[PDB]
Amino acid sequence: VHEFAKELDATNISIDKVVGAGEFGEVCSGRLKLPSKKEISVAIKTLKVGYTEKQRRDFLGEASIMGQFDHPNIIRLEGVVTKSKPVMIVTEYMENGSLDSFLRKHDAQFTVIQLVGMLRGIASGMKYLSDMGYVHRDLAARNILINSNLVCKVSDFGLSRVLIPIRWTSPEAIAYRKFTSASDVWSYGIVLWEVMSYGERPYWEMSNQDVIKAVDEGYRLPPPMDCPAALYQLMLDCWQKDRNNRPKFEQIVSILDKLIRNPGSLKIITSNLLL
Numbered sequence: 001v002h003e004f005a006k007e008l009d010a011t012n013i014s015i016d017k018v019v020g021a022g023e024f025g026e027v028c029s030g031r032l033k034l035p036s037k038k039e040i041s042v043a044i045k046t047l048k049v050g051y052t053e054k055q056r057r058d059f060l061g062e063a064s065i066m067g068q069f070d071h072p073n074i075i076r077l078e079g080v081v082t083k084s085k086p087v088m089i090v091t092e093y094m095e096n097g098s099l100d101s102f103l104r105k106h107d108a109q110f111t112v113i114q115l116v117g118m119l120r121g122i123a124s125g126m127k128y129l130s131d132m133g134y135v136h137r138d139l140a141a142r143n144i145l146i147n148s149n150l151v152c153k154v155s156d157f158g159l160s161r162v163l164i165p166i167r168w169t170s171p172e173a174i175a176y177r178k179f180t181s182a183s184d185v186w187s188y189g190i191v192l193w194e195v196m197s198y199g200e201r202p203y204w205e206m207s208n209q210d211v212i213k214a215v216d217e218g219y220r221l222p223p224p225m226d227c228p229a230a231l232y233q234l235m236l237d238c239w240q241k242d243r244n245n246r247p248k249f250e251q252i253v254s255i256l257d258k259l260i261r262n263p264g265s266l267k268i269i270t271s272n273l274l275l
């Protein structure tokens, strides 16, 4: 764990408030004093009192993964506290919380260019993650955090592994656990839909067996209200049945960089599911 995560001194951490509930314990906000004396706001996950040794290994396991990434669009690991209790994982603070809950509060309140900026960040983070040989497997708006400047960053590495949420998972990964960077691109397509839908749930409350069967039959989520044609086409490209025909994350970033540069192109606007 200490290979990729520095041990922090608990005397340098102050806890301010509880801002979330985790699988392994609470999530809090607070402050960290760095060796340079600079003080930064941080998020702190704590391991619940009375944890089993297995829970501890799973909890810290996420930090070992997160710690291998240094990128503007992947949540920064400040470090861990293991030598005292409670055991903690400390990351950079993200003022606006999870992306899905954030967008739900602001339905139709952002410009297309702002939403594209968010999507570009996510795609750039995923490009780095895939470059490093990791498949996330849980890429979803709820696992993206967003800061005061609207910068989006991939978080939650609980399911990730070196090379399951049905609604976000590619058909081949559902069918026989074929997880690749192309299955993450499928997931990214779902995130793209979530963003353009301001946090609508993918497939709403459809039974899981019907999400599985419908997608396998060729059905896809419909265009969100007022969705630019270019962005809906990108979803469809991400959702190709043949994984080899899906764009790579580098191509997705490049697509989005073009849309940011030419805000004009976004002016062409596009059963519940579409075949």
Ligand SMILES: CCCCn1c(-c2ccccc2C)cn2c3c(=O)[nH]c(=O)n(C)c3nc12
Pocket (backbone or CB within 6 Å): 019, 020, 027, 042, 043, 044, 045, 062, 066, 075, 089, 090, 091, 092, 093, 094, 095, 096, 097, 098, 142, 143, 144, 145, 155, 156, 157
């Ligand atoms: C999708 C991640 C959920 C847990 N987590 C983390 C986080 C994520 C992974 C490992 C360690 C931590 C502290 C930061 N933050 C933050 C944050 O900085 N700011 C927030 O508002 N929320 C809700 C957070 N929730 C988390």
